Ligand binder design. Structure first.
Ligand SMILES: CC(=O)N[C@]1(C(N)=O)O[C@H](CO)[C@@H](O)[C@H](O)[C@H]1O
Ligand SMILES: CC(=O)N[C@]1(C(N)=O)O[C@H](CO)[C@@H](O)[C@H](O)[C@H]1O
Ligand SMILES: *Cc1c(COP(=O)(O)O)cnc(C)c1O
Ligand SMILES: *Cc1c(COP(=O)(O)O)cnc(C)c1O
Lengths: 810, 810
């Protein structure tokens, strides 16, 4: 047992054991003779869950009594991952449970692997929401996460013949012990219908009704006895729905399809009706809940003092016109008063600048689905443009650029413009991203209301991303500076005075080696794949995207391979290149990239001459639980997106906190990370945002690079001739064609500097001691990237509430 | 507290209370400050449930050790009703829980009303299966009820404008505390595909796979510590199902629709594909489970010694060819050996003789859905007819009459013929019904294999239908003969020596009066309807059907009304005529009858001259929980189906056990009931089966009755002229037209004798003392109609197992 995992008291271990047996008997209705590991996992989950309820009930009762300002974090995604270990960590029950299960003759780590990931997210945006919930609870904020309870989360990725195959993520199959259905708080949500204009107000009538049933999941703060709530809505059809008879009953599924599945798109907008329904569904149900809670604390002037609504991107942007609809149509407030309340209540966070990810809904869709909201949006736009016109008289083009309504083929509503107009604060997720917002995408808006624009650099929770996934590292750190850093990551700074400490250097390196052995083993157990634990673990895990440039990584791998075949008996630092991530089902290029990766592996991994010097592995079904395993085992973190495309990135922070060195571009949060650790302790390369713009003004011509770089030329010719696809020589024609003629992300432009930088990485790896010393400098300066810091800034600069680290009663 | 409700021990009441509070806290995650009656109901349900698990686990472990012959009761319907009180009754926890909740300041009766009925049945057939499970557990048989877990059971009936409106029975909305999902025992079921004939055997390939997930519900025996299992299958789509992406995920519902809803038809066959899928689904999953359990006890010669499969009607008839498919195709047994095993394992129970209820599936449907089963059925038919041909040489018409395959417009498979051929026993559900089977419908089959035909008169469980719904009556009975009768109903005979006992007569009458007041009150509480508790409670509750002749009851009500208007100041015994029951959604005539009933009420209930002398009420949403309320409060039980149409009837037995006198035809079980109590203690009237046949040979002409009975003529003219439907004068034209020209059930033919008999009933009611004495004679002789007797006969004469009343350890 390690210190950071809590005490294994005599009384508590005994109590845990009896409750474990009670649940196995009464809850699972099983005896030890027929119980399977899954049954044991559930018995443990219910045992741990019991310890939450007491705190959950008093935390909520506490907020009722003290009535603080409530924070409502609206998101269509909450990438939670597993809950068992995280709960034990935050409740200081890990060692006790480890001991108790040990005495029952069970391996707790084996049981934890049985829990299904709650994959209600796609990647960064969803995971961010998860880290935020953890931090808000840890900082004692009366926060509520509101989203959708998807029956099917992000699809499970299978690799067949080197191709990605998707299969339903039936995560609720065996039941979810963490959620508590609250059917008693079911709310009605309206769709379609029409607008009637009577004497005293407009009415939305003849609507189709869908019920929203809430499910509450506890969110425990770190050892402070605070347990907040994440409320996920589930779609239910009313009972007089469609009410020949048989068909009417079967058609109930049409209404319940709203919460059936998560759209698997990462940084891409797909204007489908079902998605719009999901967005309004979560918004409509949540707002009624918010107002209900408010009225139970009618002058809505105090609404903004008791309520803060944070929009995670534009997905829940309809909250703005829905809040207006309710205040104006239902509560009968005058427009101006209602608008004042709305702006002061809502804040919007932008997560990207790539045009294809921007939500622009066709007016005809809103027209049919939400007629009243479309009217309110036109009215908002009207009054907004009147302000623009008055601020910039005669600037007609600005008016059309800022309009919430975009003209053209089909009129569309720019949801981002809607969010800026109806929010008192708009923020980017990293300094460079936030600056880009003010200088480009939202320049006109920043000019009109500069006070609205802020920055809130992303962060990650040190509980799940350090203590939970890397106990060995958390331990050796605690041994030298205590445990306070876990909820005050800035204290890792103190590790700077151990950079020359021989014992520490040795332990840091030892922990990494153990993590690598542990992962190298897992690889063979669950995926029959052998790798050399002594090689440098070069990993790039994140969603497959052209802007992420997994292709640039591929070019390097092929370069390494060609160099080896060129001079076989020459020494080179051994490397295990691991690339993992899911591709959106309809993203063809992303799926071709996955195939290319596996294709490269097929050649490289079986070339006798290469031996154990180079291995290319594609990490299947990358998800939160897998991240917790690979990240602690990585040496090199690949954060190589084209400058200006990765709003922030969070995977980069996870790697930095876990002892991996970073090779990347000055993009997103990488800039601040390098700034914190010092550029000398970072492997920075490639074009800066300015270099990219210069190239765009000049005109990007990939051919130029192809003509001037022999090694690059050789790679393209190998791809084109079928060297990596014998049976299908032209298999990768689309890839080569894109690289050569329409590469929006300038892969070739950063090739030379990338490769060169990679050589510097290999050189440092040859010097174990100095590599580890640089690692210590990174870990020691990663404190700024804790989501506790991020949330503290949101609370103080946007929500107007003070974080607290005071422990609530037991 | 009453004696039959068990002891309210000091230790147990204390234990119950703490566990109630534990569940409210840890299970429902609520505090007393926010708990609603529903939360309290669930806390109690979980508390009671806890007492079942221990016994449930050892009962099943017991069967594993002793390995007795297992009884598998296959049914597409299990009309369970509520489970809370029944569980308390069988566990002798009722008084303790009553006390415990009392001390917690809660009214247990109020909490029981919150439980949703498990309405997984239509009427008699489904309820019979429920009573049987209760009796099999009480008799210590290793029995398993196997069926489908419908998401939506029988629809909830709403009456709007006097018309029936159906609405989804979302009984799982708030969760079901009684079931235990067993996802670990999920089994695959195949559909469609084709048959491949290879060298060594035929193969069923290219099939669509649907998963069957089982949910187990405990079935406690009466105070014997036995807890059997009812396993209900739920349809689940495999995860690589349909696996653009979004659509594939949404289409999973196509496969899961199989267990979505119960077909609401009572005694009517609807040849829909979805229904056929449900039938094979339950059969395929169940048989794999049966064989699995058998192999874990490969000579299948002992299969019939360890397994008995009872087919509740033909709904699960595919078990016969499915068992053959498995034994022949999968286990590779020779046909003859397989057939021997199948016949010795299966037994079939017929529940009706009406042609429209007989299952005849179109060959083209089986051809597409279950190609292999169709081949097996042809093969069975072939060999079967060869036996017929050899037994009755040259009788070509017999061959075509007995064929499992019916020729004509579209070829169909007669499932009843299939069941007779593949079963070692076939039984009717009442003596007269069983005789009718041998003399008519299955005459040819009886001639070929007379040994197969048996009778097993239906019964009802005295636990739910006496002790649970009528504690007051169970108590006064127990006070004079003890409690042993509850599991040995024949002992009620002893009450015969109290027929002249003044105290007993007074108590029996008192209990009835209290039940009537209790019901008259409930009527006003939940349905704002006032009635006179001193009137005779004339009730007919059962599914709406023409053969049940609710119309004959209507004619009498109208007769009573017309007589009163004719002589207003003449005295007549006051009556409250209550009619209730659901009509199948697509059964037009049944829906018109409901409207007629409410229409009669509209006129009769508001006629000043009638006063409180006559009231016509339609009992809305008749279901098991409502039956438990009305039956104990009834004085007169209407069992007036045309002789030969009601196979048995079970509602009739419920009324007899609860102190109501019966007016009915010599049909179904009424014959045996009258035989048991003595015809002098029964109000028998109308045509006997023989009279009906005579009339059919002559030719039924309704006009004749219309011309010779003035009162009848007046009623038809009132209906035709719009007397009961002013705004819509011809509203009931279909009813009159049917009555006059195509009445398959000869309503007019029994009118005169019915009315006359009703006069005899009123006469006896005027003499309280003698009415009650006749009641005592009925209750005292109702013992034969206990399902314990029925099940004991099934066990000894069909399954070959001995019932046991021995209590298993605590
Ligand atoms: C739209 C969207 O999901 N954007 C992203 C992401 N996950 O892709 O949000 C996360 C969280 O802010 C950022 O770190 C990524 O750089 C940004 O692209
Ligand atoms: C088919 C069918 O459900 N038949 C019925 C019924 N419920 O309608 O079965 C029950 C139980 O045996 C019998 O009492 C009824 O007389 C018979 O009609
Ligand atoms: C952290 C995380 C991400 C975000 O990774 P980036 O490299 O910032 O894109 C995505 N997926 C999972 C499973 C994560 O844990
Ligand atoms: C007993 C019962 C029946 C069967 O009634 P019959 O009069 O035999 O048709 C039908 N429905 C319910 C709810 C029952 O309790």
């Amino acid at each position: 047992q390690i210190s950071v995992r809590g005490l294994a008291g005599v009384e508590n271990v005994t109590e845990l054991k009896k409750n474990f047996n009670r649940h196995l008997h009464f809850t699972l209705v099983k005896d030890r003779n027929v119980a399977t590991p899954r049954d044991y996992y559930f018995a443990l989950a219910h045992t741990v869950r019991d310890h939450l309820v007491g705190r959950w009930i008093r935390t909520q009762q506490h907020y009722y009594e003290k009535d603080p300002k409530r924070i409502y974090y609206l998101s269509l995604e909450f990438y939670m991952g597993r809950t068992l270990q995280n709960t034990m960590v935050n409740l200081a029950l890990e060692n006790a449970c480890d001991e108790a299960t040990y005495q029952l003759g069970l391996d707790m780590e084996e049981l934890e692997e049985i829990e299904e990931d709650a994959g209600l997210g796609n990647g960064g945006l969803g995971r961010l929401a998860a880290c935020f919930l953890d931090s808000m609870a840890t900082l004692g904020l009366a926060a509520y996460g509101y989203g959708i309870r998807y029956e099917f989360g992000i699809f499970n990725q299978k690799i067949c013949g080197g191709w990605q195959m998707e299969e339903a993520d039936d995560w609720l199959r065996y039941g979810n012990p963490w959620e508590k259905a609250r059917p008693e708080f079911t709310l009605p949500v309206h769709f379609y219908g029409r607008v009637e204009h009577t004497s005293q107000g407009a009415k939305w009538v003849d609507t189709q009704v869908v019920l929203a049933m809430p499910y509450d999941t506890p969110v425990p703060g770190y050892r402070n006895n605070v347990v907040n709530t994440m409320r996920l809505w589930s779609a239910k059809a009313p009972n007089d729905f469609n009410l020949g008879y048989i068909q009417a009953v079967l058609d109930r599924n049409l209404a319940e399809n709203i919460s059936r599945v998560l759209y698997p798109n990462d940084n891409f907008f797909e204007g489908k009706e079902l998605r719009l329904k999901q967005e309004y569904f979560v918004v409509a149900a949540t707002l009624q809940d918010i107002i209900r809670r408010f009225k139970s604390s009618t002058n809505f002037d105090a609404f903004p003092d008791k309520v803060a609504i944070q929009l995670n991107d534009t997905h829940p942007s309809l909250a703005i016109p829905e809040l207006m609809r309710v205040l104006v149509d239902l509560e009968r407030l005058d427009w101006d008063k209602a608008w004042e309340v709305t702006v002061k209540t809502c804040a919007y966070t932008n997560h990207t600048v790539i045009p294809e990810a921007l939500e622009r809904w066709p007016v005809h869709l809103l027209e049919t689905l939400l007629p009243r909201h479309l009217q309110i949006i036109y009215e908002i736009n009207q009054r907004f443009l009147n302000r623009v016109a008055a601020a910039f008289p005669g600037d007609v083009d600005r008016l059309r650029r800022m309009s919430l309504v975009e003209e053209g083929a089909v009129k569309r509503i720019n949801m981002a413009h809607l969010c800026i107009a109806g929010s008192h604060a708009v923020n980017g997720v990293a300094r460079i991203h936030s600056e880009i917002l003010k200088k480009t995408i939202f320049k006109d808006f920043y000019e009109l209301e500069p006070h609205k624009f802020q920055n809130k650099t992303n962060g990650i929770t040190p509980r799940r991303w350090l203590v939970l996934c890397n106990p060995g590292l958390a331990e050796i750190i605690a041994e030298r500076i205590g445990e306070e850093y876990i909820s005050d990551l800035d204290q890792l700074r103190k590790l700077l005075s151990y950079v020359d400490d021989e014992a520490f250097i040795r332990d840091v390196a030892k922990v990494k080696q153990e993590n690598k052995l542990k992962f190298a083993a897992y690889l063979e157990r669950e995926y029959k794949v052998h790798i050399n634990p002594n090689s440098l673990f070069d990993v790039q895990v994140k969603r497959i995207h052209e802007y992420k440039r997994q292709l640039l990584n591929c070019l390097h791998v092929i370069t390494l391979y060609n160099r080896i075949k060129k001079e076989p008996n020459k020494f080179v630092v051994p490397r295990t290149v691991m690339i993992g991530g899911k591709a959106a089902p309809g993203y063809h290029m992303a799926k071709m990239i996955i195939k290319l990766i596996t294709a490269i592996g097929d050649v490289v991994n079986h070339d006798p001459v290469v031996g154990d010097r180079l291995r290319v592995i594609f990490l299947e079904n990358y998800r939160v639980s897998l991240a917790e395993k690979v990240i602690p085992a990585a040496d090199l973190s690949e954060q190589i997106s084209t400058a200006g495309t990765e709003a922030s990135g969070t995977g980069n922070m996870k790697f930095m906190l876990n002892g991996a060195l970073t090779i990347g571009t000055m993009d997103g949060a990488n800039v601040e990370m390098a700034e914190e650790a010092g550029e000398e302790n970072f492997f920075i390369f490639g074009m800066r945002v300015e270099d990219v713009d210069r190239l765009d003004q000049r005109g990007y011509n990939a051919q130029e690079y192809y003509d001037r770089i022999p090694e690059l030329r050789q790679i393209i010719e190998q791809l084109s001739s079928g060297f990596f696809s014998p049976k299908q020589p032209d298999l990768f024609k689309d890839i080569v064609n894109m690289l050569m003629h329409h590469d929006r992300f300038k892969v070739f432009a950063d090739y030379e500097e990338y490769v060169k930088c990679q050589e510097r990485v290999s050189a440092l790896y040859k010097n174990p001691r100095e590599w580890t010393r640089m690692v210590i400098r990174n870990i020691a300066t990663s404190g700024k990237f804790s989501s506790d810091r991020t949330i503290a800034q949101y609370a103080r600069e946007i929500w107007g509430v003070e974080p607290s680290r005071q422990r609530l009663p037991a």
